[PDB]
Swiss-Prot record, chain C:
Keywords for this protein: Cytoplasm, Endoplasmic reticulum, Ribonucleoprotein, Ribosomal protein
Pfam family membership, one: Ribosomal_L27A
Annotated gene: rpl27a-1
GO MF entries: structural constituent of ribosome
PROSITE patterns from the UniProt entry: RIBOSOMAL_L15
Protein name: Large ribosomal subunit protein uL15A
Subcellular location: Cytoplasm, Cytosol; Cytoplasm; Endoplasmic reticulum
Subunit comment: Component of the large ribosomal subunit.
Cellular component terms (Gene Ontology): cytosolic large ribosomal subunit; endoplasmic reticulum
Stated family: Belongs to the universal ribosomal protein uL15 family.
Amino acid sequence: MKHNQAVSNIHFCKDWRSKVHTWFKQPFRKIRRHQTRVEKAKAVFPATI
Amino acid sequence: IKPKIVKKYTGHFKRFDSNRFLRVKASWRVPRGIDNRLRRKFKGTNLLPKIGYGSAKATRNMLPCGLYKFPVRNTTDLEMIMMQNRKYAAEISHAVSAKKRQEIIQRAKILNIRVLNADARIKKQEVAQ
Amino acid sequence: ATRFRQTRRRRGHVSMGYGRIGKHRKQRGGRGNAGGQHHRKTWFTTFHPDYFGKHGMRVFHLKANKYYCPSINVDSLWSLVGKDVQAQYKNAKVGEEVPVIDCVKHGYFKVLGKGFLPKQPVIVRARYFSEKAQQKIKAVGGACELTA
Amino acid sequence: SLRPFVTIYDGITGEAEKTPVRLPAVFLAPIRGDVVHFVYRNQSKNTRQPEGVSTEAGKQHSAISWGTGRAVARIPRISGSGSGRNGQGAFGNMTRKGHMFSPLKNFRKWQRKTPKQMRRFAVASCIAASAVPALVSARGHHIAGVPQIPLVVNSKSISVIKKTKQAVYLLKKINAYSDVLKVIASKTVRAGQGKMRGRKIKERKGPLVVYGNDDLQAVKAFRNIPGVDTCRVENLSVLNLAPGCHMGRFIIWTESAFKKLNTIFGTQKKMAQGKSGFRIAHAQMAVPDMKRVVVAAEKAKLLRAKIVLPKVPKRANPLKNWA
Amino acid sequence: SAPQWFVPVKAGDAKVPAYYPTDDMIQEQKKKLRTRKGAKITALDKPAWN
Amino acid sequence: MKFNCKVSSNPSKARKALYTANASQRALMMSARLSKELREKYNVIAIPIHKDDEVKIIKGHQKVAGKVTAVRRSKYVINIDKLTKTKANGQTVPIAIRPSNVIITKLFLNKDREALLAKKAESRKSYKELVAKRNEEVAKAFTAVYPALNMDIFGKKVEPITEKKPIRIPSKKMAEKLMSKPTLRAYKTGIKVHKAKNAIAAYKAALAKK
Amino acid sequence: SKDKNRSSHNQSHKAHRNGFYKPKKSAYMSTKGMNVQVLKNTKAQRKFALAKKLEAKKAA
Amino acid sequence: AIDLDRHHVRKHVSKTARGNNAYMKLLVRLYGFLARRTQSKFAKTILHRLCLSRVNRPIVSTSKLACLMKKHPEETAVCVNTVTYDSRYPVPKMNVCALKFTKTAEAAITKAGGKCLRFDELALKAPTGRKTVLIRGKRNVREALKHFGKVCAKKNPAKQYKGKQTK
RNA sequence: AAAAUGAAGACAUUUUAACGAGUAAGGAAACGAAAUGGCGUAAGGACAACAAAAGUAGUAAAGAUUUAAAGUAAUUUAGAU
RNA sequence: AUAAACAUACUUUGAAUCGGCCAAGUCUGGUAAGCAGGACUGGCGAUGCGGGAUGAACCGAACGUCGAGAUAAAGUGCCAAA
RNA sequence: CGAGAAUAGAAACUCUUGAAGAAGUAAAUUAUCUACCCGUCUUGAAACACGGACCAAGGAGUCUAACAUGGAUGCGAAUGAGAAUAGCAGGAAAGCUAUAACAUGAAGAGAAAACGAAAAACUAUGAGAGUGUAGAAAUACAUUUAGCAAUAGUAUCUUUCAA
RNA sequence: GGAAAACUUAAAAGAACUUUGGAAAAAGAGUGAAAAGAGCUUGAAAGAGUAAUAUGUGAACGGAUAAUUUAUAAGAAAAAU
């Protein structure tokens, strides 16, 4: 450390590379849930309440 | 009318040690070595590109004919410099075919535009033709 | 944008702007906040003089929701209902209707008294009141109401 | 706010309608190319798929360095014997068949963030720039034959368009086909390694058909014409209105889309209803013109006369120059 | 009127643009190079300024 | 545009499926177009080629007419008895032709070509009459909105709008200042070039009058 | 591995590049540490003058 | 050579609008024209303040305008910065010229009978500046200024950038 | 650096004056009078014959070898094979 | 008295560096050292050019590309201009 | 004899060479002057210091995360709400919409209990705006008003054992 | 433990007969748009061979200035009164 800075507290000393979760499935969770909601809307028809 | 073009140095600033090693090309590079003979400007080896060699602003980028180079690709690009035929000279690009080169050369005669590639890609009509 | 980095302007310079005497080696005094009491003590004294030590009593399990108490000054009370409502009841007094400023509804629990109040009676309803907050509200002709 | 009238044209008969529509307030928003460049630079990165090299690529050997004392460099060497690989270089970034410099990880930041009000600011400055014929033509569009550059077509004409022969007819009637034909005649093939990835054709841009909620059935007719993109009025973005970070797109509006512009974007005095929390900005100048100030200052005899710098005489030697 | 930068020349059955004039209304102008004046002849007995 | 997520628009997968296609699929890709006389007789545009058919080469060096002697589905080519080359030492070899460079001028119809031709003809009629149902409905909508016009107008010439109404927008003054230098110089050069073309045209028109 | 212990060489040249910074005028006008009575006397008059200035503002 | 004290380096004063804003670029052109021709020290001041960076053009609330224009009734406030709205206190009637006006600030100024002007109208009406009050916002109120220096200092300590184990 | 001029000319304006050595190191991009100026590699989005066929290309692409020209230089341009 | 507005006062952020060596109308330990260590200044390092035949530090003088002249150190038998 | 001033006048040229190749430029050779091996560590290397036989291709400040400063940008006592998430058209890893949890901020001090900011401020210097006169070309002095930013210092107020 | 190695052409039309030779091959001939001739698209550098040109006493190369040789390369107008 040099000059004026905050004291750094970063918990990367472990293996974070195997702890990384990526949200590439986020755009397809929306499609999966919405489609399941629509099939839920039928079957129990009316009042999928 | 044509101004006198003055070149402060007509030689090439060849890279240091390019005359001794085939891996070192001749394109210029600044010697950054701590002990380098050239960057210290020793006597004998004291030739580096400086802004002081810059040519005059009036005649910079001027062709020996006294005009400027304007690259053209078809007959429409000639119309961009028809109003400045005393300043610009046409220059057909290297990839333009021989057929389109005839139209550019023919149209430039009509518009009185000088072409510097007027003898390029001429057909077999040199000997007995 | 990696074309605007300094690495593109230091191509050809041997050491990439890190010096020839003191190279760009792996470490420059340790890893993390190492040597905070031995050789980086001048850094911790200069910039974080109370880093090392203890102060105060431990709270084994802190209930930070008990210390939640948003505050609003008296000068900021009328902005909760807007200037339009403020001018509507500008000439109100004792006897007729006076707008009620429910701070809890807006997320403010305690009313502190800082700045000035427009000279109109107002009913301020909140959970806690500062001492000067009640004085300033009463001096303007208003009333203080408690909640919860 | 005079709010000049805008004429609406029948797309089939070519006849102007009898009721002009006032220009929506979104067309007077400041045209800020620096804001659009900020938003467009961020938004153009959002279609990117995640890519990365294999995590074990180049690291699949038990190689160790031979050390010193063996007249070879200290880079790790492939262990064993019997093949040309054994005793060769190893994981090092400079070695052949070793891992590269910091291997590209698939959890890189692919998509970018942009504040919503900055995106809405950029879209407004892109709709405004499409009503300036000087900017639209400078973008590379052929609009010399259109009646009005804020081109609006009757909603009754759009309601009957069901085939691409009818859609092409409407673009010919409103003189918008010259830009479509520019895309057809200039369609070329991509240069470089991008063709092995499947991207071969490279087309130019033509008119953008902005349609409303009642014109959903005319999208099919327009989608097969080369160089014609259709976008709904609510879903406009800098990727449509300023493709290639060059604003001034040629937009063909419809009646339903045009009459929704005041609701979607609000006014310079009113809050937007479609985009809640957003209002059209005022430029740093109310009338972006320097001429009216210059003449008014001259009317008050406040500006001095224009100065032409005197020619400084060359230094002479009075001891030798008698003159 | 012809712009000062425009000096039309005859096209020998070559393809010409729409704006360019035809050959039936183009008159070739001689190329002019000399633009200075020769020294004036004075009286035989008067001496030259030089 | 393709909206079927099951099929692929990747060129590499398309060529791979071409080289590894089974024999059943290779027959259909090796198809040729019927000639004018055969098309009228059967109302079929094209069929997979067959041995002992008679074709006519329509593209290539030699436009000869011959009989099919081989249909080589491994190479996706055919052979014609009248298109051969003498292999130096005297003997001749057939020359391979792609089946898209020939048209079938005579059919070898045993019993399954007869069934195939009938099936193809019936399917052509059904789609032709299906298109007619769609065309009239599209025509019906147009007439109900423009009763004074007919749908044949969409195939004739178009008369563009000539009205040139301008709009006063307080941004035309700023337009030259909203362009970067690279696009400003191009725009100003185009203005100057366009103006000079009109100047020469006006000079030409003046000479033409006199 | 003995080294040179000390030298004042180049130190005066260094100290005169950005020359000796003088203190500002406000450094000489500090009051902390002054006489207790003088501070008491000064505060009394400043309070008196300010209170007299403020009643004039109320009057007008 | 010549024994110079220092060599010629760029003067650290801005002479043009920063950024690529087309409207701010024209305002500098307008006031650069007025400052050169009218030779008024008012136009030189406005031109100089147009070239300052965003952090050197601090905002001025309506309460600052209200206090600074109490004894300038028929005057015009001229602040080369954004004008914000102090919702705690009322807005009297006054004329303000500024680069930008907050949506709530413009509504409050106009509702009180005042007028929000831009710098093109001010130059049109008062080019040399005749009934104007020049105002600039406070610069030392930035919370970044609190951490400048040494926090161990005995006289004016800094404010100790928060981080790990901050007590 | 200072004056003058300034919607587009053009060579990053005109005039005047002073100045120009350099290891380590610094000077990101944008900013009309521009808070240094540029060359090169690859890929992506645009633009590239304005009157309805709109950059070049079997009348010879890229590449390779040389010959000349432009640039202080990085490099570029063109000819021939 | 003299000089000083591209003066003056700075603010923020940050790089590299803290192995140094030389000279002398200077000093200390040592018989002494091209030794060890210091006070002031100028240098070399980081610096080429003219001269001392040669030379990191001496003398003159510090460098954009050039033309013409007066010069500096120092030289004028030849090498070598006089 | 004669400055100023007033009155009137007198300068526009030759020769040689060049498509049988001018001027300039380039290449090779000769001659005069000139030139120690590059990179690196180092007080100091051409060094009897180390690496380097030669050529092509590859080859080394990158990515993720936290904080800060700073230049451009939007909004501004609020900002973000591409928090999850839920909808829309179009089929879409793109785009648009969601009175909204929370983050940072609007209040600060104290270990904590317990609290929680006006004398609607003062003083100094200071940005700007007018008039008059004169030099006289620009400009220089007198005089009326204004007092922002910044700096320093004061009263008053909040919390603390302590400001 | 652990490699290297992609490409004739549109199509084999992959030379086919003669002379020389033990053979491999070569020279003719022929196919082809073109040898692209199977060591097969282009074909760089290092390294060689041939042809043309030039120089020469213990290094070679570079730079400034000229000389020699070679190459490039500048024009069809036009006097006095």
